[PDB]
């Protein structure tokens, strides 16, 4: 019956929506900095029958019979994570970046203890202390920020905050920050005040894997990440860290926070970690970084600067560009909408001391990983940069038709998932 | 290169383990009561490009652009969940059953407040108050159990416990209880002490959908569930409940507990909920219940009883049989391994006042949903029951090859995922 019928017959509405979403991914230039495109092999793993297996516990130490093969899968993911990042242990079960962070904080601190993280308006993530998230609900929160003049994190200010606040755990990490964190300084501060150091490398983990961003693994007690940003894998989380925290972290993931792990997704993590060690992946990360720098450079040209648009920190060393619109007629929402009309997906971004409401903002976050994965190199990012610069410098009266044509030409020149409609679930 | 190459080329190790796990599911008789076999259409949804979309928020209330198609997907899953279960609201984003429960308790109580659930050694889940789980670490836990003579939950005893303990939230639900809960009595008790009532229907959600188990939705404030047990869907969680809790529950899922939802998995939830309304699904649930009763009856025969093996509560009204091995030379691990050798996959399971260590147990949990999905009916479950009975009554001196041949004949007669090696990711 329906056990073997194709999706198109069982649920035509959902089949049609899958096709529409594939078409949307193909037709747009995706520049949300946290998004990417998974490889075919990760699609296959996530669509595998490993979803049927209950496998609570650890490899070879399960609460269920029949785990012999998913145990090898999980050990491959763990071993590849440790090897790729140079970490002493890995836990590959977190369902997401948020669940990775929930388990780390569960392992390292108790409710009521003090957590120090980067403020949301200064580029932090909601799991770094936002009051409606578990990180704010369970813990006493302190925050550091960026210098208002340079938009860099001032490590003397972070140190002064840590000395006053005496956190149990310091989080280094970000969702919207354009420069390299000083992990050695974070470790020195953590040691000085007796705090644990968590680095949440979700955004830049793929840059780390390719050797293009300093690694937090030498410095941090524990490192959390999403698998699905620059690392380029399926939507899920991952923890690595120093051996002395392995037992606490494993127990915090299960039974502390989760039940059964998603073994099909863990199989895809193993695939993504293997891909992340290849020269092809390293070149993709190189094109990600070069493309972001090309966009930042274009947006610092005099024509854009004279229009009241500026680049936060005067450049970038990562996979994104942060745009400051405080002196522009465009607010973040208006600029996001304008770029959507051209076919480019970005998101608005709060700037520190933002004069506009938090859902409007005076900033943009523009990311390059997804287009680099799609195949864009320096020539294509030069074109993308000029499209964005023309829109932002001119404003809402810009010739959108011409920019849309240019964006469509790029999308057509670099087909996405070409052949997916013929790929099989398993085999070749 | 690697973006479009098949898994078999990118990662032969993982490709081979996918084949081995599929072979294992085909070759064994999978009788873990919390497992099932997802349909082809759910494999396709979970292997879809919807993994690439960040969609924090709710349909029509997203933080990022481009969600016009995943919004319809999520609305279909929500509307089908509400219609199938007769519920006033649904949140379809929980990553797992554990994450569904974490969000419910986040919404309904504060750290330090009192939680009353079924004791783990009496059939309850670790998210109902176990010391190392968030439900035990964040909250003050009380427990009710089963009557020692009948192994039934005594609602007079539950009421006495609630009157003395004064819980903020009462959980009704179980992972290893073989009888039907009295939801009217739980509601009466919750009202008497001013508690919220959460029903965790993870195990019996599919029985409820088919009309073969009383629904908790009329009585409960909120109902949590896994999608992947008797409901037969992809590995994930779901919450439904009364409309006055919709805002608190939605906020507790995001940004309370989670970040971005797994939209590919939510697409599969929509598919599974549609299948769960079909006559084919109801017949599968009917065969699940009849098969479990056949096994329970066979294991209460004198030859099994003489071997020190008994059936908890003297039968079953649900999809599982709980076997008590306290008077048997077999412990739970030994029986799990012996059944594995004859081709039947189960899990050991704790029993009240267990004389054996907790990782070993004095019990077995045997479930029929996966084999019912595979197509087994009363004739096949009669043979399964006799195989299990012979192994448990004879122990280590049983003719393993003779029993393994009988299990293999059943597996060969009911091919599993026949044709999967030819199915496509999308389309046919
Ligand atoms: C009753 C009940 N509630 C929650 C869970 C946890 O779901 P998961 O998706 O594993 O996080 C379970 C799972 N119990 C596993 C089992 O019974 O084998 C559950 O039973």
Comma- or semicolon-separated keywords:
homodimer, 428 residues, alpha/beta, 7-stranded mixed beta sheet, 4-stranded antiparallel beta sheet, 15 strands, 43% helix, binds a molecule of 2 linked components (PLP-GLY)
What does this structure look like?
The structure is a homodimer of 428-residue chains. The first copy, chain A, is of the alpha/beta class and 428 residues long. In chain A, the strands form 4 sheets. A 7-stranded mixed beta sheet of chain A has the order 4-10-9-8-7-5-6, sandwiched between helices. In chain A, strands 11-12-15-14 form a 4-stranded antiparallel beta sheet. Chain A contains 17 helices and 15 strands. Chain A has a domain at 43-273: Aspartate Aminotransferase, domain 2. Chains A and B meet through helix 1, helix 2, helix 3, helix 4 and helix 5 of A and helix 1, helix 2, helix 3, helix 4 and helix 5 of B. The complex binds a molecule of 2 linked components (PLP-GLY). A molecule of 2 linked components (PLP-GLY) sits between chains B (34, 96-98, 101, 125, 127, 173, 175, 200, 202-203, 226, 237) and A (54, 258-260).
């Amino acid at each position: 019956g329906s056990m073997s019928a194709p999706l198109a017959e069982v649920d035509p509405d959902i089949a049609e929506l899958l096709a529409k979403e594939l078409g949307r991914q193909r037709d747009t230039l995706e520049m949300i900095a946290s998004e990417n495109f998974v490889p075919r092999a990760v699609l296959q793993a996530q669509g595998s029958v490993l979803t049927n297996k209950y496998a609570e516990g650890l490899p070879g130490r399960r609460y269920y019979g029949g785990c012999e093969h998913v145990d090898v899968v999980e050990n491959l993911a763990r071993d590849r994570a440790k090897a790729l990042f140079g970490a002493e242990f890995a836990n590959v079960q977190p369902h997401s970046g948020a669940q990775a962070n929930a388990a780390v904080l569960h392992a390292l601190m108790s409710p009521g203890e003090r957590l120090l993280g980067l403020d949301l308006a200064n580029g932090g993530h909601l799991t770094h202390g936002m009051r409606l998230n578990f990180s704010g609900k369970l813990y006493e929160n302190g925050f550091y920020g960026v210098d208002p003049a340079t938009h860099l994190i001032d490590m003397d200010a972070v140190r002064a905050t840590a000395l006053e606040f005496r956190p149990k755990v310091i989080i280094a990490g970000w969702s919207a920050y354009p420069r390299v964190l000083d992990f050695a300084a974070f470790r020195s501060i953590a040691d000085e005040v007796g705090a644990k150091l968590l680095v949440d490398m979700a955004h830049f983990a793929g840059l780390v894997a390719a050797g293009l961003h300093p690694s937090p693994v030498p410095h941090a007690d524990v490192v959390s990440t999403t698998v699905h940003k620059t690392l380029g894998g399926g939507r899920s989380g991952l923890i690595v860290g120093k051996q002395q925290y392995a037992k606490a972290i494993n127990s915090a993931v299960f039974p502390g926070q989760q039940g059964g792990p998603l073994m099909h997704v863990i199989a895809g993590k193993a695939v993504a970690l293997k891909i992340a060690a290849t020269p092809e992946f390293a070149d993709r990360q190189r094109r990600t970084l070069s493309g972001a720098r090309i966009i930042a450079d274009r947006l610092m040209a005099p024509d854009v600067a004279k229009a009241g648009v500026s680049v936060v920190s005067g450049g970038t060393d990562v996979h994104l560009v942060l745009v400051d619109l405080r002196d522009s007629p465009l607010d973040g929402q208006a600029a996001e909408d304008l770029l959507h009309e051209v076919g480019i997906t970005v998101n608005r971004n709060a700037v520190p001391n933002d004069p506009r409401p938090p859902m409007v903002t005076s900033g943009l976050r523009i990311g390059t990983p997804a287009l680099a994965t799609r195949g864009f190199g320096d020539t294509e990012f030069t074109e993308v940069a000029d499209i964005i610069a023309t829109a932002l410098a001119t404003g809402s009266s810009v010739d959108v038709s011409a920019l849309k044509d240019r964006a469509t030409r790029l999308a057509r020149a670099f087909p996405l998932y070409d052949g997916l409609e013929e790929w099989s679930l398993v085999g070749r």
